[PDB]
Design a protein around this ligand. Structure first.
Ligand SMILES: COc1cccc(Cc2c[nH]c3ncccc23)c1
Length: 290
């Protein structure tokens, strides 16, 4: 049933499947070892992540996983996104092979580095924002709107590189359940721009608003936005023009950046291009401590 694409296909026997990854937040995904991923080095093994359909998947689940893969083929490569590396589409279940992120999602990474391993410098945190802003600038330049940019959808590699995940996910925005929670217990509506939340209008500008929430997540080291606030109350806060408080140990400039990202008028928010330039400059002048 699936079309062959020699640009991406890996023989099924080259992939040694392993243990589950991401505790189900990204669907059925496992760690694997791929033999001879690079055609130049056929005797090298690479740790990779591998997405597949759950046992009782419908035909729409298959379509959605295919869309995701094709979206990823078109978007191209970037250091700060989770890149496609291959696929097994023939004679067997569909496998979508992507880059492996050994240090987990950014929320977890930050939480484990709180003072009670190695604590993060002010520069490491800004550097973190910068890398994510870079991934997003690239995605935006390729006409991709994320729709759920958040710390949970940012993965961290063994070398502390931030990579945006799930940027090509299929989703029917007219059928979102605003009350559904992420497995960790939070509500995705808390990262959504008002225009996306009330009028279902997703744009690069609404992704920029989500980035503001993510900046707040970085500077609270994995803090939870609007803790205890249920959906109806969140709407009321948004309608009243409410904005989250400045995190402690966040400069006035970075708080102002968050606020700009939460501009009530979408046209007035910065773009990712501008955010990358601003963050580059702030990284250069932020203390590593020494
Ligand atoms: C494009 O983003 C994706 C696509 C497929 C799967 C995933 C989850 C994932 C990829 N690499 C990982 N490494 C560790 C934990 C989860 C993951 C993200």
């Amino acid at each position: 049933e699936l079309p062959e694409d020699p640009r991406w296909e890996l023989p099924r026997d080259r992939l040694v499947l392993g243990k589950p990854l991401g505790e189900g937040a990204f669907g059925q995904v496992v760690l694997a070892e791929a033999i001879g991923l690079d055609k130049d080095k056929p005797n090298r093994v690479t740790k990779v992540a591998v997405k597949m359909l759950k046992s009782d998947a419908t035909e729409k689940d298959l379509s959605d996983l295919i869309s995701e893969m094709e979206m990823m083929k078109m978007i191209g490569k970037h250091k700060n996104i989770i890149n496609l590396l291959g696929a097994c589409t023939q004679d067997g279940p569909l496998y979508v092979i992507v880059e492996y992120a050994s240090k987990g999602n950014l929320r977890e990474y930050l939480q484990a580095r709180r003072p009670p391993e190695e604590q993060l410098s002010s520069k490491d945190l800004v550097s973190c924002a910068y890398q994510v802003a870079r991934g997003m600038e690239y995605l935006a330049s390729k006409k991709c709107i994320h729709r759920d940019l958040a710390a949970r959808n940012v993965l961290v590699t063994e070398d502390n590189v931030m990579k945006i995940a799930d940027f090509g996910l299929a989703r029917d925005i007219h059928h979102i359940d605003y009350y559904k929670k992420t497995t960790n217990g939070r509500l995705p509506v808390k990262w959504m721009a008002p225009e996306a939340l009330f009028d279902r209008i997703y744009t690069h500008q609404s992704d920029v608003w989500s980035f503001g929430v993510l900046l707040w997540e970085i500077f609270t080291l994995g803090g939870s936005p609007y803790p205890g606030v249920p959906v109806e109350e969140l709407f009321k806060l948004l309608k009243e023009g409410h904005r989250m408080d400045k995190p402690s140990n966040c400069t006035n400039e970075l708080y102002m950046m968050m606020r700009d990202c939460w501009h009530a008028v979408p046209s007035q928010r910065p773009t990712f291009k501008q955010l990358v330039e601003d963050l580059d400059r702030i990284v250069a002048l932020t203390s590593n401590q020494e």
